[PDB]
């Protein structure tokens, strides 16, 4: 047949440079940065327990819920118990925010609270202060916007106005109420907030509030649970999460799991390789995932990313919402969250816990080696399955925030970095997502690693990020990540595909940014680049030359270094390169080399004339793309020697004579774009 003749023929002038326009893609409004990093500087633990005597409101049951910060208060005698609960409560918070001034108030007066709160605002001037209120020993908050504390003698419950309480506490602050009609406090807090705004004409958005209950509701009295149920959820989630798991109907599925085995669970909450730290890690992934999928992006970055303590409180609040729901309680938050209790991801938690503490009989008693959870493996598998047919802007993958959590260990880091690259590849829309979920500071921290297996994966990820957001050149020079890439660009065994990405990364880090130019110059870029300039890869030859060109762009120090290494000489080889991208990249660099002379004597001037005449033999060139850069390059030469070209220009109405004659040929170009740009530069002499 006559089909083999058709398929086997070169289609001339049908490539990217011809079809697409020679123009840069317009950068989108990148809004992924945390435009604020708030910090919770100090904490106020107001505990109104009055250990022993119950308030008149609530009649307690004979067995009853008694545990308060995992302490039976009635075991220890009244006074010691109150100090102990205060001590434990501090410790619990120090898991989440270990570097903050804690200051307890234990069965306080009103004056006592005033002096406490006013002092903490003075210290934490404009940074955030936490106010924790635990009103289990005092009557329920009133309709009139009041919260109860004691008198000096502990003979009368004194009311304290929420108005006065939000006077003493400042603007950026967070309030945690663990008492019975706690919704009333949140209502009345917002009322007095509106009331202050009306008085100000002739602290709302700043103030976050978490509350154990809706205004009508009462806290549960159930003997299995703590009294401190909300505080417990916020501040020790894994402990109640496991105790709650053992109270549900789903325990039938794991026989030999009582509450007593949960007490004796091995591990710590830091060590992710232990059993307890496994769960703690999984839990952090699950809650941070539920939040990201359920909340609008704005409100997510406000609560789950700005500051650690708030983010920890809201992560753990989602668990409170789930647990307390099962006892006719609805927790309340000030920036109101939509209901997460029925999110699918909770079924993943249930299974994760189940599998983890089905092992406890054998881990404790037999002394069996703790097998790790399949959680993170399977979640990466889901993320992978999404990518297969996930080429589109459809629903984004649920697992992005889990992929982030996996980077933190080493166990699944290689696989995640692979998948994350595969995801980032899909398009710049994806790189935007991955920056919004908060991948940036972890991907940047891995540049401190020496594990050589990461090098091809991180190089890939960073090329994708910097292709979208070029402002990250600021961050990479600060942390000395610019050294990480320099090493990869001077490594013969690293593939030429990845060395090309690396050369691009350096050409972005260096681009019009003296801090990055001075840093890469000292990391010996010019010597490294020249070693790879004659590679058998036309993309690498291209980028290495752009990279070389950018480093001495308006930077005389990198030019002098180029003269010693004799870079301009080694770049003349690229002027007769087959690929017209490379020829252009070479012309770019030799032009950028010429432009930053700063009026120096015979050494610099004699070099510019050698670079002039070498460019001046790319007039009769096939690509107009090369010829445009050839004009732009000779533009830099004209700007530098403007006094000399005025002599040549005024005459016809011998080096400069030659370069002006070149621009006349480029002015009378067949191609319109080259004739235009040549005409502009030629008229700015005229």
């Amino acid at each position: 047949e006559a089909d083999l003749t058709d398929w086997n023929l070169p289609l001339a002038f049908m490539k990217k440079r011809h079809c697409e326009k020679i123009e840069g893609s317009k950068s989108l409004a990148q809004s992924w940065r945390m435009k604020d990093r708030m910090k919770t500087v100090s904490v106020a633990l107001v505990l109104c327990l009055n250990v022993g005597v119950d308030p008149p409101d609530v009649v307690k049951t004979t067995p009853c819920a008694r545990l308060e910060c995992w302490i039976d208060p009635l075991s220890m005698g009244p006074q010691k118990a109150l100090e102990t609960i205060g001590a434990n409560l501090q410790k619990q918070y120090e898991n989440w925010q270990p570097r903050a001034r804690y200051k307890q108030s234990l069965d306080p007066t009103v004056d006592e609270v005033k002096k406490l709160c006013t002092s903490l605002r003075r210290n934490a001037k404009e940074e955030r202060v936490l106010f924790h209120y635990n009103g289990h020993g005092v009557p329920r908050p009133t309709v009139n916007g009041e919260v109860w504390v004691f008198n000096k003698n502990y003979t009368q419950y004194i009311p304290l106005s929420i108005y006065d309480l939000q006077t003493w506490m400042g603007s950026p602050s967070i309030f945690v109420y663990d008492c019975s009609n706690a919704g009333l406090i949140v209502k009345s807090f917002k009322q007095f907030a509106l009331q202050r705004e009306q008085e100000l004409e002739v602290s709302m958005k700043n103030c976050i509030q978490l509350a154990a209950c809706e205004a009508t509701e009462l806290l549960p009295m159930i003997p299995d649970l703590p009294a401190d149920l909300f505080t417990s959820c916020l501040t020790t989630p894994i402990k109640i999460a496991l105790r709650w798991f053992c109270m549900q109907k789903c325990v039938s599925l794991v026989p030999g799991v009582t509450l007593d085995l949960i007490e004796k669970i091995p591990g710590r909450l830091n060590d992710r390789r232990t059993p307890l730290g496994e769960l703690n890690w999984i839990f952090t992934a699950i809650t941070d995932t539920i939040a990201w999928n359920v909340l609008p992006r704005d409100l997510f970055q406000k609560l789950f990313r700005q500051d650690l303590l708030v983010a920890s409180l809201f992560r753990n609040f989602l668990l409170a919402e789930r647990i307390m729901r099962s006892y006719n309680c609805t927790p309340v938050s000030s920036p109101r969250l939509p209901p997460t209790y029925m999110h699918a991801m909770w079924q993943a938690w249930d299974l994760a816990v189940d599998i983890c503490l089905s092992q406890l009989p054998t881990i404790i008693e037999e002394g069996t080696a703790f097998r790790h959870s399949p959680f993170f493996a399977e979640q990466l598998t889901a993320f992978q399955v999404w990518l297969t047919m996930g080429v589109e802007n459809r629903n984004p993958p649920e697992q992005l925030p889990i992929v982030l959590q996996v980077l933190l260990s080493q166990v699944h880091r290689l696989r995640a970095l692979d998948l994350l690259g595969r995801f980032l590849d899909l398009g710049p829309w994806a790189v935007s997502l991955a920056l919004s979920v908060g991948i940036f500071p972890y991907v940047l921290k891995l540049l401190q690693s020496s594990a050589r297996e990461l090098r091809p994966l991180l190089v890939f990820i960073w090329a994708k990020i910097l292709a979208v957001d070029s402002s990250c050149q600021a961050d990479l020079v600060k942390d000395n990540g610019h050294k990480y890439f320099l090493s990869v660009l001077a490594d013969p065994y690293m593939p030429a595909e990845h060395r090309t990405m690396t050369a691009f990364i350096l050409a972005v880090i260096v681009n019009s940014y003296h801090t990055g130019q001075e840093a890469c110059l000292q990391g010996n870029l010019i010597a490294i680049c020249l070693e790879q300039l004659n590679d058998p890869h036309p993309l690498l030859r291209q980028w290495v030359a752009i990279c070389l060109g950018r480093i001495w762009q308006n930077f005389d120090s990198a030019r002098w270094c180029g003269v010693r290494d004799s870079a301009h000489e080694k770049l003349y080889s690229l002027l007769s390169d087959p690929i017209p991208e490379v020829r252009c990249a070479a012309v770019f660099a030799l032009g950028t080399f010429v432009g930053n002379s700063a009026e120096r004597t015979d050494h610099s001037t004699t070099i510019d004339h050698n670079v002039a005449m070498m460019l001046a033999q790319l007039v009769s060139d096939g690509s107009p793309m090369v010829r445009k850069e050839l004009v732009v390059a000779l533009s830099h030469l004209v700007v530098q020697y403007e006094s000399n070209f005025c002599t040549v220009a005024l005459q016809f109405i011998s080096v400069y004579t030659q370069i002006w004659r070149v621009l006349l040929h480029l002015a009378a170009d067949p191609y319109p774009e080259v004739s235009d740009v040549a005409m502009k530069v030629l008229n700015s002499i005229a």
Partner: protein, 364 residues
């Protein structure tokens, strides 16, 4: 002063490579893609047009007086070409390029080449004739330029690329399979522009004072044939050195050699014609002519067919003599007939008089 500094978008355009995807299979390799099926449909349509045209040649080329159409242009028809498969017959003038049809019978497009008032479009080709075709348009002063979307419904003229060759007018020979293109004219040089590398590869010296009036080339057995204004017909092999290049230099004419054309067979035949109007069929391996013919007294322009061996002559006295290569008479159609043009496949012959008219004849 510093404001004269322009910055190209090249480095930014280049940077777009890393925003776009990499890992996945390209759009062309996909066997079930819509672009490949339309490309395979074009190649299926091509193979039919080669077969159908080959069948007309096998019947024995009888008389030739049928006129498919007669239209009139705004300008004088200077050069004519037939697009190989799709019926698009570009008839350029001094400036513009009118795209006519001979099935519908309609004006499809009208360009401006962009060249000044003194200049003239001498030569023309069809690059990538098999699919997604382009139109090379060589100007007499030196300028070469290439046009996409030239006879489309939803699109306008679009110049793909353009570059000064050189510096008769200008002559060109496209070579689709090799990827080369060989400009020549008033200069004493035959350049060879590689279009994959967009650089002048070889500059073969002609070794001749007069202008290179015509230029035709061969793939497989590399043979740049080049007729000349003084009368001679050189042949060059681009494998050997530039001092050696002159394989043959036989001279049996004296005028503007209107067309010294070579055939694509292994039995190559240089059919050369002068202003005096006399064919001489040469071979590459001999020093003198094999066959001899004398056709028209005052010849003005001529064209020769690739597949079959037709020779379509012109005349100062309005005649259009269409003979065979052997020298047999078929027609003498009675009306400066400055452009004749055969199809690469079908035995259709265009004509364009000094008066502003076009025709396209056919052998039933």
């Amino acid at each position: 002063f510093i404001s004269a500094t322009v910055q190209t978008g090249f480095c930014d355009w280049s940077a777009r490579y890393f925003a776009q995807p990499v890992m996945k299979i390209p759009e062309e390799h996909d066997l079930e893609s819509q672009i490949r099926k339309e490309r395979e449909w074009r190649f299926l349509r091509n193979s039919r047009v080669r077969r159908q045209a080959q069948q007309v040649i096998q019947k024995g080329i009888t008389r030739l007086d049928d006129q498919i159409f007669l239209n009139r242009n705004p300008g004088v028809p200077s050069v004519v070409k037939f697009h190989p498969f799709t019926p698009c017959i570009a008839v350029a003038d001094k400036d513009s390029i009118c795209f006519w049809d001979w099935e519908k019978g309609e004006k499809l497009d009208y360009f401006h080449n962009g060249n000044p008032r003194y200049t003239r479009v001498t030569a023309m080709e069809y690059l990538n004739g098999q699919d997604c075709s382009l139109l090379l348009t060589a100007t007499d002063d030196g300028a070469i330029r290439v046009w996409k979307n030239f006879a489309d419904l939803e699109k306008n003229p679009e110049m793909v690329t353009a570059w000064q060759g050189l510096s008769a007018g200008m002559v060109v020979d496209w070579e689709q399979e090799t990827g080369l293109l060989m400009s020549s004219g008033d200069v004493r040089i035959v350049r060879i522009w590689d279009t994959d590398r967009e650089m002048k590869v070889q500059d073969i010296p002609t070794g001749a004072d007069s202008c290179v009036t015509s230029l035709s080339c061969d793939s497989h057995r590399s043979l740049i044939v080049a007729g000349l204004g003084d009368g001679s017909i050189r042949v060059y092999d681009r494998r050997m050195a530039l001092s050696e290049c002159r394989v043959m230099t036989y001279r049996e004419h004296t005028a503007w050699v209107v067309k010294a054309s070579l055939q694509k067979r292994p039995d190559g035949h240089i059919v050369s014609v002068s202003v005096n109007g006399d064919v001489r069929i040469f071979d590459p391996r001999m020093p003198e002519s094999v066959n001899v013919l004398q056709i028209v007294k005052g010849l003005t322009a001529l064209d020769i067919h690739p597949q079959a061996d037709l020779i379509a002559c012109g005349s100062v006295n309005q005649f259009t003599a269409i003979y065979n290569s052997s020298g047999e008479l078929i027609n003498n159609i009675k009306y400066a007939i400055s452009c004749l043009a055969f199809h690469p496949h079908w035995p259709h012959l265009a004509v364009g008089s000094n008066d502003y008219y076009i025709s396209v004849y056919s052998v039933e």
